[PDB]
């Protein structure tokens, strides 16, 4: 049950059972250090809880009920109250998994990819919006209005903006 009061008012007190080292900082921050070396830190101003594990993993819990987990591999995973999980990868990719299973990926090249739970995949770039279907069919609409269908057979059919076929090839 040791107690140290530092000249600045910060208190360090061991729990009655000897297991938790509790620091109450003069600014209202509180730190608990556990036997397994887990550190739990409450930031009073931000009202945020920050847990640091021995392996270096960190988890933050914010007032708005968001959680952010920092993984040793460099990923940062943000969980929203509604169950949406957003992962930030080291390469700059951001992938959100919605509660219905939909995946929305934001890529460092400007593109947005949506993977629907039906297998269908939508790719949006500055130059086109493309839909890929599980069988191998691809429909691409260009910013200029041209439309290309690739069939799983190798056939590629291209149409002008009015829908007139201007190219239809197959090997």
Numbering used by the authors: 954 to 1124
Show sentences the authors wrote.
Of particular interest in this regard is the putative centriolar CPAP–STIL complex, as mutations in both components result in MCPH. CPAP and STIL are strictly required for centriole assembly: STIL at a very early stage and CPAP slightly later, possibly by controlling the organisation and length of the centriolar microtubules. Instead, we demonstrate that the TCP domain of CPAP constitutes a novel proline-rich-motif (PRM) recognition-domain that specifically binds to a short target motif in STIL. Our mutational analysis of the interface demonstrates a remarkable correlation between the ability of mutant proteins to bind to one another in vitro and their ability to support centriole assembly in vivo, providing compelling support for our structural model of the metazoan CPAP–STIL complex. These data strongly suggest that the interaction between CPAP and STIL is a conserved, essential step in centriole biogenesis.
